[PDB]
Design a protein around this ligand. Sequence first.
Ligand SMILES: CC(C)(COP(=O)(O)OP(=O)(O)OC[C@H]1O[C@@H](n2cnc3c(N)ncnc32)[C@H](O)[C@@H]1OP(=O)(O)O)[C@@H](O)C(=O)NCCC(=O)NCCS
Ligand SMILES: Nc1nc2c(c(=O)[nH]1)N[C@@H](CNc1ccc(C(=O)N[C@@H](CCC(=O)O)C(=O)O)cc1)CN2
Length: 563
Amino acid sequence: SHMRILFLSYRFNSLSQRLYCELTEREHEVSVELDVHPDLTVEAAELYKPDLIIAPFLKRKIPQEVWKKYKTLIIHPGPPGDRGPNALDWAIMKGERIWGVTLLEASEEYDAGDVWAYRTFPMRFARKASIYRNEVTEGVVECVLEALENFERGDFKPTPQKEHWWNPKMEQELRRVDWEQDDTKTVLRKVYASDSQPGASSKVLGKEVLLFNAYPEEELKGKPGEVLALRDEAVCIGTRDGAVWITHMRERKKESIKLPSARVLGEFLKGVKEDPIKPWEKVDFKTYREILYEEEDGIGFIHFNFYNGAMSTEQCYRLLETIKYAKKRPVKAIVLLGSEDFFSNGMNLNTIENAESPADESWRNINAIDDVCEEILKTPDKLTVAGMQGNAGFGGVFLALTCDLVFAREGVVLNPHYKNFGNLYGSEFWTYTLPKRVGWEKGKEVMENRMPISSKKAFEIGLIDGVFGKTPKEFRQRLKERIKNFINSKDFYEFIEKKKKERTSGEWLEEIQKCREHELEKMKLNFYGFDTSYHIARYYFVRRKPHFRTPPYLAIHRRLKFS
Ligand SMILES: CC(C)(COP(=O)(O)OP(=O)(O)OC[C@H]1O[C@@H](n2cnc3c(N)ncnc32)[C@H](O)[C@@H]1OP(=O)(O)O)[C@@H](O)C(=O)NCCC(=O)NCCS
Ligand SMILES: Nc1nc2c(c(=O)[nH]1)N[C@@H](CNc1ccc(C(=O)N[C@@H](CCC(=O)O)C(=O)O)cc1)CN2
């Protein structure tokens, strides 16, 4: 019953990773072939001889030689009968109330194969990536697990499609924001449909840009197209009936880097005044709040919505300032909540690559995230909690591990490792937090593993302290009630008493410092030494360069001892 399954994916993306966790933790073997060349895909399937092929994310046709020989099921992020490469883009642009996902059989015509499973769900008015990572992903997991059981059953007959419609690749002219003609709702719809790829084209201050990560603004009312304000490198732009914040942009050029808006517009933003809102301020209206601090029931909650989970050096210092604020408050616990889509993905590779010296900026960024980690660790008189509502990878996983307690939503995927990105040693005090949780033996195994793990697996191995809730909202409510009941028990004051004794002693203070300097010694060699694999890997990743090989940690079939 344990199947051998081959994934065909354009990239090993969030959906591919989630499915990888769901299948392998059910004791199926999953090998991945990235979509490099049809000839390579033919070879992959003849080497691996899968029981079943699943294509979670693919942008071109599987060759007939493969799907006529091996049963091949393709994910489509739309309901049955929807066909085309940009299903979610069109669903958002058209304002569809209900949407869905479909698992269909490979065929010669795009998205025309018989249906193995499907789920429908109501749409949210939200970024494409948010729909993809939540509703679409959860529905795909259900369809794939259902198709697996039906495949093992042996007698299954898929349903041919009846009604169908085709939506082609959406052109940039359809996404383009015209500030004079588009009200705020229209700007949001266009950016949402284009986020995180490929962006909504527009002209801001006479510059051709692509827009990402929009938020309505209800106070600042200016003139259509006028850059009204700057807040944490996001810009606020007047629309037909109001204003919208745009936090990130990209020059309308090949292989340009997605960056905070202020680093793209740059010289054209002289005279635009910063308009700050401290995270702890209460505000009556809709606006962009990168970081939000709220106190409830003796708990201080810190939301930090860093686009794509990437924490630039400057974002790290803004988070650090909010943590220091919270530590002076009369709360018994501080909870780091990240955002709904990500807890954290560690250093911001985009702002590093864009820096005059990416090596220097790497150094600044890793010291800044370590300063956040050290501030959390040196909190002897309050409980600290990491609540991972969404995925965490790289330095962001070990950020969470500096908190006393780590909890995650069901279905969150963790990448507690670096080795994919030119073998960084990592820091964030992992040489202290990881052995304390799972020991050194199991600790090195965790960081040697280059594949994702679910929050359920992380809990089973003792990497985190609990997993609960199906949605961000349900996770936050359960987390709050769990912490509330703990900080009002006797074991809280007993826990804090032991934490005070330990984290005020010089021996603990000394051990922590030695951990940081050892990790940063290794990291400095990653950044400045003869090996430049980190810099090369960074260049390809941030500029969306295509894959030319599937590495052996993904492709079981491309390993040496294979038969
Ligand atoms: C984007 C999409 C294509 C899926 O990819 P994904 O969910 O983003 O997968 P990932 O796990 O790699 O997400 C990581 C993101 O966080 C960014 N990120 C993470 N850590 C980062 C860091 N330290 N620094 C900078 N950026 C970071 C990544 O750059 C990436 O963002 P990007 O999409 O702008 O490149 C999805 O939105 C979509 O629309 N799919 C439809 C296509 C389809 O289904 N076709 C048919 C399939 S059979
Ligand atoms: N055997 C086969 N292979 C497939 C599918 C299939 O059902 N049958 N379904 C594919 C997923 N859905 C689509 C639908 C349309 C397009 C498409 O239209 N692509 C452009 C390429 C431009 C682009 O990058 O989008 C083209 O002209 O070929 C790509 C994937 C995955 N590969």
